[PDB]
Amino acid sequence: AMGKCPTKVVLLRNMVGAGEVLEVETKEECEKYGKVGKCVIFEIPGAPDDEAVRIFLEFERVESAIKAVVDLNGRYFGGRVVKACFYNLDKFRVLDLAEQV
């Protein structure tokens, strides 16, 4: 599974439903793990409520991404259980953000 392979890009699922609108706020929260290159919120218009909103964080170093996944996977956030994993760097760069993880 793509989600298990360590990269600089972290995918956060089930952090919020559709919607609200966060990119600056999540990015600011994830600075504790290290420098964040960018943050992309992608909404799948399907879609199960715990998979509708994908939040991507590209860290400047892989160390920061790993720390974030370990710290946030399984975390309780406003009644929701967050799923954190890695995402393929190449897929992220061409904005192919709907891949199975």
Cβ atoms of residues 85 and 59 within 8 Å: no
Could you tell me which residues are beta bridge partners of residue 13? Answer: 54, 83
Residue 77 belongs to domain spanning: 7-88
Cβ atoms of residues 88 and 4 within 8 Å: no
Q: Work out how many domains the chain is built from and give that number.
A: 1
What method was applied to determine this entry? Answer: X-ray
Peptide bond connecting 68 to the previous residue in cis, omega within 30 degrees of 0: no
DSSP H stretches of helix in 1-101: 23-29, 62-72, 89-93
In the block, tokens 């966060």 appear at 22
Q: Provide the CA 51 distance to its chain's centre, in angstroms.
A: 11
Q: Tokens standing for 62?
A: 């892989």
CATH of the domain at 59: 3.30.70.330
Enter the resolution in angstroms.
Answer: 2.0
Question: Is 100 contained in some domain?
Answer: no
